[PDB]
């Protein structure tokens, strides 16, 4: 079981993105109590504006209404109005009130937090003037920074658990983790983005998050790390033979972590191996000429 921790940032969900813009040019009348950094819910009034670009088209609709126009002479002058910009919403008011629409109220498309706000009291609004950028955070995103070298340490079967210092009281629940196709050129780090259920908005975007990773490896012989004696030329472990005879044996290390090494070969499951007092014993067998014998027996 490979285990390694990584740093991570809690971020806004980028699939919760909405940059509101006016369908046509006009001027701002009212701007509701709001600003960047605030949290708006789907429906919140952003600002009031007067758009004259449609006045001419709407009146020609009301004209026909009173002059006994055709049913289809309306559906056609309403799409002439539909693809002019005027929102189907503000249009439904036109037909249900028979009055010209001059003042409209832009609202927040999604539940989220405002990150941008370029229009304020007294200005004139333009087709591009982003009235308000609102980013969500319900299924909040959290991305971890994996070093290009340790990349191999992550696979499909890999188990993940998030932990946020800001909240030691909230058990997190990951629902989708992804290994982005590219690697941050700026930090030489693989990007691992995973979205976590933020039901109660207790996991704010920008706060630290620690991602611990668990990864299954190839099936191998497994012994404790205290058991492996490494002299940078030979890998040995002191075996406890049937009779109680301490006999050293050479093994071949594969990888190790969590205080448990893994030999690629050199032993046999069921076999016993010393953990505590391993040093004295090895030394005793070194004096005894055992380690010398074992190495000579080949």
């Amino acid at each position: 079981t490979f285990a390694q921790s990584f740093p991570a940032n809690v971020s806004y969900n980028e699939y919760q993105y909405a940059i509101v813009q006016a369908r046509a040019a006009g001027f701002i009348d009212k701007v509701y109590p709001l600003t960047v950094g605030d949290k708006v819910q789907k429906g919140t009034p952003l600002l009031d504006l007067t758009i004259p670009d449609w006045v001419e088209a709407q009146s020609e609709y009301l004209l026909l209404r009173e002059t006994g126009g055709t049913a289809t002479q309306t559906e056609g002058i309403l799409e002439r109005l539909r693809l002019a910009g005027m929102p189907e919403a503000d249009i439904r008011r036109l037909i249900a009130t028979q009055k010209i629409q001059t003042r409209f109220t832009l609202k927040a498309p999604i539940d989220g937090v405002i990150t941008a706000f370029d229009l304020r009291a007294g200005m004139n609004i333009a087709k591009d003037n982003v009235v308000a950028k609102i980013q969500g955070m319900d299924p909040v995103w959290v991305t971890a920074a994996i070093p290009e070298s340790i990349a191999w340490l992550v696979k499909d079967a890999s188990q993940f658990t998030l932990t946020v210092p800001a909240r030691p009281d909230k058990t997190l629940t990951i629902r989708k983790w992804t290994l982005l196709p590219g690697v941050d050129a700026a930090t030489r780090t693989l990007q691992l983005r995973l979205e976590v259920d933020n039901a109660d908005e207790a996991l704010k975007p920008g706060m630290n998050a620690w991602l611990q990773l668990n990864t299954a490896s190839e099936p191998m012989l497994l012994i404790p790390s205290q058991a492996l004696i490494d002299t940078g030329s030979e890998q040995r472990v002191i075996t406890v033979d049937a009779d109680g005879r301490f006999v050293p044996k050479r093994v071949a290390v594969f990888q190790a972590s969590q205080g448990v090494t893994a030999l690629r070969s050199g032993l046999a499951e069921g076999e016993k191996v010393v953990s505590s007092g391993l040093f004295l014993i090895d030394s005793e067998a070194n004096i005894s000429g055992a380690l010398e014998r074992m190495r000579s027996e080949s």
Binding site: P7, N9, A145, N208
Partner: protein, 101 residues
């Protein structure tokens, strides 16, 4: 914490080894007396540790040591151990005599 706060190991040490001294600013006469200008700066509480400044934004919000590390108190590195009567390890000392005396 380092990666997250944009602070390096190199930076923390230099910041640490620059916030644990006392300063003398000469004297200053008044009432025909001699007033000495002392300046605090030694580490005393563990807070003085937690509150080592590493990074300060233009805004005014600083980033302290407590943000990149914990400050636990523990033992040191030993070169030798002493044990008494098998029922406990303790510390003591030997008295060494001036050779000839």
């Amino acid at each position: 914490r380092l990666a997250q706060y944009g602070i390096s190991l190199a930076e923390v040490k230099s910041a640490l080894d620059a916030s644990n001294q006392e300063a003398g600013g000469s004297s200053i006469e008044l009432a025909e007396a001699e007033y000495m200008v002392r300046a605090s700066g030694y580490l005393q509480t563990l807070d003085d540790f937690n509150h080592i400044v590493l990074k300060a934004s233009e805004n005014g919000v600083p980033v302290y040591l407590r943000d990149v590390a914990k400050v636990q108190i523990g033992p040191e590195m030993r070169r030798g151990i002493a044990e008494l009567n098998g029922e406990g390890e303790v510390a003591g000392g030997v008295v060494i005599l001036r050779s000839g005396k």
